[PDB]
RNA sequence: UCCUCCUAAAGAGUAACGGAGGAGCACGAAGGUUGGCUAAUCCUGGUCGGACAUCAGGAGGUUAGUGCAAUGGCAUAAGCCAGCUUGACUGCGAGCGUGACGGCGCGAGCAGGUGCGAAAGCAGGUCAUAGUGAUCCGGUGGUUCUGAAUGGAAGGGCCAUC
RNA sequence: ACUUACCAACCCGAUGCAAACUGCGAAUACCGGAGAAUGUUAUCACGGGAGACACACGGCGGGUGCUAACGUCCGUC
RNA sequence: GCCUGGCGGCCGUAGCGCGGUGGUCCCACCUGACCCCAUGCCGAACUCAGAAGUGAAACGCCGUAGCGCCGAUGGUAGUGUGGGGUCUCCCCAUGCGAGAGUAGGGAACUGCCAGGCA
């Protein structure tokens, strides 16, 4: 159970995030996604992931 | 090309004098010639396998293909995706320019004594032979290179049998014997 | 071998098609010549028919195997369907690349009206 | 004794025993022996019934074994309560069906080989009777 | 050694034929976890993820067999 | 505690300190879509190379393969390779299956926005079935719901999450 | 470098066995639809009150046991 | 009337093997490929521009019972209900009735559109 939480965090001003799981030692990089914010209605790049 | 208009005139006729064919297209062809090495030291280091690429390229010209292993057989401790070899199908015209440059001055070269075996048929038509000797080809110098790994060419007619095959490659400069 | 590629190719789309419950142009290409029919629903009848192996369209061009040959071809179809009412047809490739003279044919119907 | 080499599960159900047996007719041999009730048949008599009859005609003659030992049979120790699981192995047994053929003959006269299977079914604990090839 | 210890909630096999539950896309007609043999006959709507069959609004439910490999398809007839 | 098979008597369900095996994960691609491809094994011929590495041809037609135990599936591929991508989206959801209940599961279709494709279309994670822990208590972010004389604040509620 | 009083894979023919084998396959049972007769609604829903959750033996199909037990554990009458 | 191409019905009595045969059209081979497009390398495949030549391969058609495939009648096994026996297994009345095997069959049939030939 190597594998741990993080949560992706919206580029916009909106406080809206998703939570997912990612492993640290195969690929310590930064995760980015793009992701629909409910908050603003539109698709958005996504951060914050270890 | 002078050998791709020869098969075109004459020869051909040979064959169809020979073997009675009711149809032009019942004489055998020649579709391909295949570039085989498969050195097989990759395990040891990629750099035999990049260095082999390079010699065979030198042959050919463009560029050679790598090939993978099928399985991951544990007597050659080979892995699965581990490339061990390199190869060519070179085809039409460049085919001819090879063959053509192979004939005329590689083989006499090759133990102008024996030259090859005259039995070397699979049952089909295919006819192929190991050059064991990379330096025979001149075109690259060898007096730089490092290794003397050898070569395998196999030439793929359409022949119907093995004595359609001979027969076909008789017709062309290939001594045999 | 090549044909059965082909078939092997093409039959996912062939039946969905089916499934949607949609007609469907089908276009069969040839070295020679370029064939399109319009396909009924339920697979069995066929509505409307164009090709390169009538006395029309092909004594009025250069040489049939073409994309100039396939965009005639195209126009006829697209006209004889107008015609006959039918719309909203689904084109299928048949196992053919969608960039070749199947290109054209498909290009020339979209244009003329029938609803790709 | 006879038992399989490797088995595929080494304990098996019990199982019933009935209907008639499939293999009722004299193949290899010319004289055969063909039980006429059910019952079980352990290697350990089919061994001393092979025995009987290949002393009782020393060297002629070949012998066929139609039935072999398949499932094995367990037993639990003497002194041991009920339950905790299923015993072991300690012998492997044939089923057989009335009407099965367990042993044939060809190269003998038929007044010795009756006496074989004489001597062979004074062995065996199910009863049985001796039946001729015949044809068709 | 070790026994006991077989999972539990097999779940289901068959759930009708015909109009037994008809109404709108149901969720029966179908084995769980089988796919061969039980397919959807175009009439019907697709599997799930789990390879679960349904309807799409109404008809009776019917079983056949046909096209290459003799696999069996369920379709149900829209009225 | 959970998953697979038999027992289990051709709908479901069905016990024993009955007979056999696994799980307490993994993947940012091993997901989505478009395009393409087809296995194991054996035989013949050929430098190192041989029982087996790679090459050509011929038999064979899935005995191959699936991220992981077993069953059921898979050629249309659910198996193999490549391009672009984040639908592993948000709010709902007719209808249904399975449970004493708590609950668990499948789901067409609607609204918003998005990816692949020429388009028809597909996508609400992975071939499916294990990879899990109620309530209470508290922590973090958002909210303009409450705020004990009034204005604030503390605390509480609601949404996400530990 | 020949020999073989030796064993033996694959393949072909014949012969058996399997709860965890199936290129086959019933009788029953179950689900759904239509119809006649018969049955004091025998069916379902809601509400008030319960008791009960130690079962026994016989037949049939089984697991376990030694197809032993007035043994033991299931299915159905 | 035939012959050919495309899309279907059906899913081996529809397959495989062996022999023969087809080029007006169609189909496939087939020529070239500076380009559209492409090969983990290769106009092999995909793709483009053509019609000199050949039905050799492939494909269509015809014959052939070597194999695959289908397959009765009868008997047998099993089984629901009722009854019986020496009851671990059977029998009788009645209802249902296999699998395997035998005789035998079998070298598919069929719908729509288009073209060549009357
Ligand atoms: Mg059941
Ligand atoms: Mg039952
Ligand atoms: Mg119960
Ligand atoms: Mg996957
Ligand atoms: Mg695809
Ligand atoms: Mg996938
Ligand atoms: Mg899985
Ligand atoms: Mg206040
Ligand atoms: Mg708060
Ligand atoms: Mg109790
Ligand atoms: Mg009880
Ligand atoms: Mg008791």
Request: charged share 30%; proline share 3%; net charge positive.
């Amino acid at each position: 159970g190597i594998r741990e939480k993080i949560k992706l965090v919206s580029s916009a001003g909106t406080g809206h995030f998703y939570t997912t799981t990612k492993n640290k030692r195969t690929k310590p990089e930064k995760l980015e996604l793009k992701k629909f914010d409910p908050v603003v209605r539109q698709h958005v790049i996504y951060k914050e992931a270890k | 090309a002078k050998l791709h208009d020869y098969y075109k005139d004459e020869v051909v006729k040979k064959l169809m004098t020979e073997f009675n064919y009711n149809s032009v297209m019942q004489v055998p062809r020649v579709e391909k010639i295949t570039l085989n090495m498969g050195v097989g030291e990759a395990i040891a280091d990629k750099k035999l396998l990049d260095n082999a690429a390079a010699d065979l390229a030198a042959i050919s010209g463009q560029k050679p293909l790598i090939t993978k292993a099928r399985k991951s057989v544990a007597g050659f401790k080979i892995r699965q995706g581990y490339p061990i070899g390199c190869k060519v199908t070179l085809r039409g015209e460049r085919m001819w320019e090879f063959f053509e440059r192979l004939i005329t001055i590689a083989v006499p070269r090759i133990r102008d004594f024996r030259g090859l075996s005259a039995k070397s048929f699979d049952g089909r038509g295919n006819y192929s032979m190991g050059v064991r000797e990379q330096i025979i080809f001149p075109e690259i110098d060898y007096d730089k290179v490092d290794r003397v790994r050898g070569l395998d060419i196999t030439i793929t007619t359409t022949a119907k049998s093995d004595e359609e095959g001979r027969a076909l490659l008789a017709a062309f400069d290939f001594p045999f014997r | 071998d090549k044909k059965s590629a082909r078939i092997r190719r093409a039959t996912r789309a062939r039946r969905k098609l089916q499934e949607l419950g949609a007609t469907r142009l089908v276009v069969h290409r040839t070295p020679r010549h370029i064939y399109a029919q319009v396909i009924a629903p339920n697979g069995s009848e066929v509505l409307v028919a164009a090709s390169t192996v009538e006395k029309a369209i092909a004594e009025q061009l250069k040489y049939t195997g073409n994309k100039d040959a396939a965009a005639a071809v195209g126009k006829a179809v697209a006209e004889r369907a107008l015609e006959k009412g039918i719309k909203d047809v689904s084109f299928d490739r048949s196992g053919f690349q969608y960039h070749g003279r199947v290109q054209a044919l498909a290009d020339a119907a979209r244009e003329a009206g029938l609803q790709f | 004794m006879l038992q399989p080499k490797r088995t595929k599960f080494r304990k098996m159900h019990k199982g019933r025993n009935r209907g008639l047996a499939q293999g009722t007719d004299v193949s290899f041999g010319s004289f055969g022996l063909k039980a006429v009730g059910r019952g079980r048949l352990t290697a350990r008599q089919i061994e001393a019934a092979r025995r009987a009859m290949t002393r009782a005609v020393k060297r002629q003659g070949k012998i066929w074994i139609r039935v072999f030992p398949d499932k094995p049979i367990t037993e639990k120790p003497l002194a041991v309560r009920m339950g905790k699981g299923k015993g072991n192995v300690e012998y492997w047994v044939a089923l057989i069906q009335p009407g099965k053929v367990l042993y044939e003959m060809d190269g003998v006269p038929e007044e010795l080989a009756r006496e074989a299977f004489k001597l062979a079914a004074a062995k065996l604990p199910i009863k049985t009777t001796f039946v001729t090839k015949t044809v068709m | 050694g070790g026994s006991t210890r077989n999972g539990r909630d097999s779940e289901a096999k068959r759930l009708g034929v015909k109009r037994f539950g008809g109404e709108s896309v149901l969720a029966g007609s179908i084995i769980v976890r089988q796919r061969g043999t039980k397919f959807h006959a175009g009439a019907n709507v697709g599997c799930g993820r789990d390879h679960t069959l349904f309807a799409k609004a109404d008809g009776k439910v019917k079983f056949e067999v046909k096209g290459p490999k003799n696999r069996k398809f369920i379709s149900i007839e829209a009225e």
